[PDB]
Structure 1
């Protein structure tokens, strides 16, 4: 004569705990993880053009350290610097190394165009046993070591116009002898100087004589500088000694290129997101793998887990 109709909802034997506004842990039927916390341990060669530096830093590949000759004219989306990288050429320093490395990494190309510089009155192509190329002495491939021709080192004054529609990056340097004897032996002048300028910029460098610690048999050094010449501008190099001349320019580009420090293997696969730990999927909005990323990546958070409830409050049955 009567009936009973009860309304209800489902429950699962084991739900998941989630945080809420009023609760640190409350059980729900289902939840989903929002923080990516694991990596494959390998870097996928797809879809970004990955360039393994192997035992070359981007700077050594740029200068032309003999063992980095293989990177001549390379391009990349992500240049990967290995910790095993080392230098094996003339001992040098780059005042403001981070900026040079940054702007080159960002440009994304090592394309070098040789230009016909004329260095009149000097002997070119100097080399060192600290930078052997094959059997004998060599030097960085993109630089030209000029020494005195006989009894005088003249006041070099050359120009190279940027008649193109793009920016030219010129890398050049100055030689710091370890003694005055070396200074006069190579450059005659007791004190050299290099002035590199465009119509808007100008840089004058004076060599610093002195003994530095021995590196590859040498106590002298080379300091690297750079000059970007915009279309229509002109490059002028003036010097009466110590000039480590450029052989041409690197083409500059703007794009998505960068550089990363990582010893992770490069594997054949596809992944939008790269961290030094290896690639990681980007299906989740956050990640806790590494704050250093490249590509379409989840945002870095300090948490290793953040569950989003995708079900109702779990209230299991009575029991009998």
Structure 2
């Protein structure tokens, strides 16, 4: 093998470099190269990518989401909920130093951290009907605070919930206000969640606090053969029919011993 990543039948792969799948899909500030992504043939990820979830926490069913990305060749990102749809909540103060952008604190771009506005947090009751003709990947989250002082300082409500409801999804959440150790400089956590919204189906969000509200979702506009490749090999500006993580194969042999 010549030890380079090539195009699979003339389609450029999605090479995330130091970004991860979670940082890409949630919109990491250190992944702004991949805000608008064309159609790919396969996804290339590093073995230990530096730009993971910048705020500490987790993406729930992350490996199920990565299994669904082996059957998706193109996303077309749309703004399902604009930031002007939150008049009574602060959409600009939700930043942290764990997600820095050019030295200044920032946040994920595909979701909005909603802080209390005018020392109040009214109960969010918002819905989005999928009027498109294809499936929609919607990512939201919950912020687990550190103490009750942080809970009153950020959301004004001591006991909050998050209700998410679709045709097949019934979700009720509550923040786990506890003491953790410092990961990435922050003591709080953020559990992120995803679903696939079918056409002619609505998603309903209800919360009175701790809501990492979605702004950008992803339209699944193409399905087909794909994979997520764990490879540190650089791009080679080349085309091929067979690709391995260590390098593409351009031969007609019945066997190879390059990579499983």
TM-score, length-scaled by structure 2:
0.90
Aligned to 1:36: none
The answer to whether 1:257 aligns with 2:226 is yes
Tell me how far 1:238 sits from its aligned partner. Answer: 0.4
Per-residue CA shift, 1:113-151, capped at 9, x if unaligned? Answer: 113452242111311122122342210010100011233
Aligned to 1:62: 25
**Match for 1:80 among 44, 52, 56?**
44
**Match for 2:243 among 257, 274, 279?**
274
* Counterpart secondary structure, 1:211: coil
Whether the aligned pair in 2 keeps the contact of 1:40 and 1:278 (CA below 8 Å) is: yes
CA–CA distance in 1 between the matches of 2:101 and 2:18?
16
Tell me how far 1:87 sits from its aligned partner. Answer: 2.5
Per-residue CA shift, 1:4-45, capped at 9, x if unaligned? Answer: xxxxxxxxxxxxxxxxxxxxxxxxxxxxxxxxxxx2222223
The answer to whether 1:93 aligns with 2:55 is no
Aligned to 2:162: 194
Corresponding residue pairs, total? 253
Per-residue CA shift, 1:280-311, capped at 9, x if unaligned? Answer: 234112222221xxxxxxxxxxxxxxxxxxxx
CA–CA distance in 2 between the matches of 1:116 and 1:94?
20
* Counterpart secondary structure, 2:207: strand
CA–CA distance in 2 between the matches of 1:285 and 1:174?
50
Which residues in structure 2 correspond to 1:171-210 (within 5 Å)? 171-210=139-178
Which residues in structure 2 correspond to 1:98-247 (within 5 Å)? 98-117=63-82, 118-125=85-92, 126-247=94-215
CA–CA distance in 1 between the matches of 2:115 and 2:81?
18
Tell me how far 1:111 sits from its aligned partner. Answer: 2.5
Residues 270 and 200 (structure 1 numbering): CA distance in 2 closer, same or farther, change over 3 Å? closer
Gaps of 5+ in 1: 1-38, 292-320
* Counterpart secondary structure, 2:243: strand
CA–CA distance in 1 between the matches of 2:157 and 2:195?
25
Whether the aligned pair in 1 keeps the contact of 2:73 and 2:226 (CA below 8 Å) is: yes
Per-residue CA shift, 1:133-184, capped at 9, x if unaligned? Answer: 2342210010100011233211110011111211111100000111121112
CA–CA distance in 2 between the matches of 1:264 and 1:207?
40
Whether the aligned pair in 2 keeps the contact of 1:130 and 1:218 (CA below 8 Å) is: yes
Aligned to 1:14: none
CA–CA distance in 1 between the matches of 2:18 and 2:141?
23
CA–CA distance in 1 between the matches of 2:120 and 2:227?
45
- How big is the alpha-carbon RMSD for the aligned residues of Structure 1 and Structure 2? 1.8
Whether the aligned pair in 2 keeps the contact of 1:59 and 1:101 (CA below 8 Å) is: no
Whether the aligned pair in 1 keeps the contact of 2:166 and 2:203 (CA below 8 Å) is: yes
* Counterpart secondary structure, 1:109: strand
CA–CA distance in 1 between the matches of 2:128 and 2:173?
20
